[PDB]
Amino acid sequence: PSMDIIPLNELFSSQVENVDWIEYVMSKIRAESNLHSRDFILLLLDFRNSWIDGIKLNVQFEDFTSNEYHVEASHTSRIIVPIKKIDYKKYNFENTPIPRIYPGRQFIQSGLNEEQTIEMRQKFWCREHIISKLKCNWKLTTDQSVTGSVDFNKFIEKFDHKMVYTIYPGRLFYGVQLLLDEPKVKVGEIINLKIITEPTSTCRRKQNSTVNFLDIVIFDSKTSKILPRSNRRILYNGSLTKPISTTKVSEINLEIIPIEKGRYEFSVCISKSNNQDGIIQFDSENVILSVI
Amino acid sequence: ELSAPDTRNDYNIRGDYIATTPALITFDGNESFINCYEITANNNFDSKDIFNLKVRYNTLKEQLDCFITDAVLIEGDVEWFILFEKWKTFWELEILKKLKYDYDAFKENRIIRLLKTSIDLNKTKSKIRNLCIEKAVLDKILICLNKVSRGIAVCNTDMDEYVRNLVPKQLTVPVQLPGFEQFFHVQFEQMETSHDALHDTIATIGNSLSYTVIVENLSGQWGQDVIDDGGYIFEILSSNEWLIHGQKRCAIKEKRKEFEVHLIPLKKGYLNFPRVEITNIN
Amino acid sequence: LLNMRLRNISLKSEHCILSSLDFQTSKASEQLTKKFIYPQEHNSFLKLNFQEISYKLIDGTSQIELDPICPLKVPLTAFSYDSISATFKLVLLPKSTQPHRVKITLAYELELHPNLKLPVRTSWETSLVNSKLSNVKFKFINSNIKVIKGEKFTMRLQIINSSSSPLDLVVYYNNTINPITLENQYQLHNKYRKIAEGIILLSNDYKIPYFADLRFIGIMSGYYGTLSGLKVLDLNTNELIEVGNGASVLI
């Protein structure tokens, strides 16, 4: 009787690799050596028992396995499954499925009809993707062999707006990777940084400013980003604002002339304009480099 | 471009900025455009010469109206054969009072007049009459630069044909001081509360004065404050300066002010006055 | 009037009180004897500190400063040793003695002996989270102690009630980015993103009915000071009060 979805950022380590989901994501990422994280989001189910004995609670999503999740009498327990998030460059998701009573009533939509009619379509189609694989099998604790399932279509409520862009990239605007030369540069050396941006199908709401202003912000990999005047820390050519199109895969550059450092971090944001409160999204792509 | 001076220095500069991926790297008088230059020193120490910058700037106010001139009202080479030619200086007495929208040219809205005087200006056809591909077809192009303002119409495509290349070239001082020495303080932290995970800012200095001083500040802590008393122990090498600290307290107004108003001072052994401090809390 | 001395005391509330005296060279006295020293062809002074001691002023007591000290002698300098006091509860201003022994010097003889002692009071003087309604005090039974390694761990919110309806309330973590000078927008966004996404709280709406265990897992690194998000909520309208307490490095 609740639901929450949380992304993932830490690669993790081998000595803690004994709980099921981290060894699942690590084992899945031993091959396919382009992804590391930020693509293996993690959804938080919370099973609650309204009965009078323990149950054992497996869950299998796709090839995910579980432990012997011993639940108790009236005890809520939280069960953690990892999913690769729904890519909109493997699909399109602009289809309403008609129900099973073809009564031909042919009703209205009655909102901003290009926005909510496909927005709630995005909601219950991502709910269709979550429902259509998630499988549980439960047996009562040493007093039966009652091995049944537990259906979910009376349980998963809707998706709120956090639980759309957490599950579905393509709710927010630009897909961004960050292509770098080396992570292990010495001090006196010059590095081209190369972000690569992908404008989306869901830029169709505006089209007005084809130009859209980004930023590049540099974090210390503790906290507390360096200022524009990055004195004795990092050096660069020109103002970092460096526009992109809402047309195609634009590229951009800087020249991170490093000086007297270690363990930096680079990430962007999207600002649409020059003014304050123009900023509309903050990406989370955080490529770190070290300086020796 | 920053380059060599007029001596036989041959300094191994490697930093530069040519606009190589754009040709139009804009600027709008509120942001930075920081340009950085690595001037690595040659076979000797770096001297005190005068270097020279080379900036090939241009104002925006000639660039933006080329699509308002060579595209909007000079399309056909017969419609711009004689219509422009006998009134080019009349066009340059017309477009010089354009007063374009350089107050909202940050976000969008390039190539718009900002409504200085739009309606009274069309009386110029009366007292002087010329070819109607200019005298009657450019008032529509004056409306086409009044409305129809494109946010970014790829303005580097129609730039290089008419943009003049101004070139300021200022000096560059390499301004500095002259006293080279060194230091190396060593330290070992004494427990206060718990280790807070200390992080380093830096270690370098440059100074020359009369009754000269060299002040230093400690590292940066990112746990709970009033932190561990750093106990320090000197190796004040290669000189004889004057110490002023012993076993400070690392999140406070204490400062290991190793002053130097004294002798044993070599001169000009590097790019400036330098004394590589390099404190070590290990 | 040869070496100006000052004592600075800082009140570390989670430990003892720390007070450090500080010697200096007193420049308005150094140029005095510098004039006669360069009259006798000497560049700087050679005062020798041979017996420096802080004693706890009482009927009779003495202490020992919190690191090591040799018998030193410096020309134009400053030194500062630190000694730990005892953090008083309320209203007892302790006093100290702070004796010293500067030995001056001349041409291998004529060591004019000096001594000084400035006795004064060592009181400069500039984690329970109360409920702020009915003294339902919360304290973690191991606060600020956790070196986890992205493993599970358990804590202990020892709630202390009025023992008058002691079964009332529910904890929760609120994994949601709060909705908030442009880099003042970005620092608040990075703080609110790393708060609401780094740890999970495996017992979410635990509904406590007076210990708790509260197992977390913690999926990103970094020092999480003050551990925000971990709210409780109680029988009245909105007792949405924080814990504001406890911290964990996760590496």
* Of residues B223, B245, B252, nearest to C78 (C-beta): B245
Say if C125 is an interface residue toward chain B (CB within 8 Å).
no
Alpha carbon C227 to chain centroid, angstroms:
19
Identify the chains in contact with C, defined as 3+ C-beta pairs within 8 A: A, B
Closest-CA residue in chain A for C208?
Answer: A75
Minimal Cα–Cα distance from A285 to chain C, Å?
13
Closest CA to C23 of C93, C107, C106, C82: C82
Mutate to test the interface with B, among C66, C125, C146 (most CBs of B within 10 A): C66
- Cα–Cα distance for residue pair C130/C113, rounded to 1 Å: 58
* Of residues B31, B151, B202, nearest to A211 (C-beta): B151
Say if A235 is an interface residue toward chain B (CB within 8 Å).
yes
Contacts of residue C88, Cβ cutoff 8 Å, sequence gap at least 6: C17, C94
End-to-end CA distance of chain B: 43
User: A235: which chain B residues are within 8 Å (Cβ-Cβ)?
Assistant: 34, 36
Distances (CA, A) of B248 to A238, B169, B187, B254: 41, 49, 10, 6
Block residue for tokens 């929760």: C172
Q: What are φ and ψ of residue A214, in 5° steps?
A: -100, -175
CB contact under 8 A, C175 and A4: yes
- Cα–Cα distance for residue pair C47/B211, rounded to 1 Å: 21
* Of residues C150, C151, C183, nearest to A225 (C-beta): C183
Block residue for tokens 């005298």: B135
Q: Quick check: A43 and A13 in contact, CB under 8 A?
A: no
| Alpha helices for A224-292 (secondary structure H) | none
CB contact under 8 A, C67 and B244: no
Identify the chains in contact with A, defined as 3+ C-beta pairs within 8 A: B, C
Closest CA to A153 of A122, A184, A178, A132: A132
* Of residues B222, B226, B246, nearest to C12 (C-beta): B226
The strands making up C120-121's β-sheet, listed across from edge to edge, are C56-57, C95-96, C120-121
User: B197: which chain C residues are within 8 Å (Cβ-Cβ)?
Assistant: 223, 249
Minimal Cα–Cα distance from B219 to chain C, Å?
18
- CB atoms inside a 10 Å sphere around CB A214: 23
Closest CA to B146 of B98, B106, B108, B84: B98
Contacts of residue A135, Cβ cutoff 8 Å, sequence gap at least 6: A59, A60, A61, A149
Say if A8 is an interface residue toward chain C (CB within 8 Å).
yes
Closest CA to C74 of C35, C30, C107: C30
Contacts of residue B280, Cβ cutoff 8 Å, sequence gap at least 6: B184, B185, B186, B187
- Cα–Cα distance for residue pair C173/B274, rounded to 1 Å: 53
CB contact under 8 A, C80 and B192: no
Strand partners, C248: C146, C224
Closest CA to A122 of A89, A90, A84, A170: A170
Say if C203 is an interface residue toward chain A (CB within 8 Å).
yes
Contacts of residue C75, Cβ cutoff 8 Å, sequence gap at least 6: B242, C44, C45, C46
Q: Quick check: A287 and A266 in contact, CB under 8 A?
A: yes
Distances (CA, A) of C128 to C134, C137, C147: 14, 7, 22
Q: Specify burial of residue A27 (Cβ count, 10 A radius: 0-12, 13-18, 19+).
A: exposed
Q: What technique determined this structure?
A: cryo-EM
Q: What is the DSSP string of C26-74?
A: -HHHHHHHHHHHTTTT-SS---EE------EESSS-----SS----EE-
Minimal Cα–Cα distance from C153 to chain A, Å?
12
Q: What is the DSSP string of C191-249?
A: HHHHHTTS---SSTT--B-------B---S-S-B-S-TT-EEE-SSS----------EE
Q: Token pair for residue C116?
A: 């000084």
Say if A274 is an interface residue toward chain B (CB within 8 Å).
yes
- Cα–Cα distance for residue pair A81/A59, rounded to 1 Å: 8
Strand partners, C115: none
Three-state DSSP class for C109? coil
Contacts of residue B148, Cβ cutoff 8 Å, sequence gap at least 6: B111
- CB atoms inside a 10 Å sphere around CB C232: 21
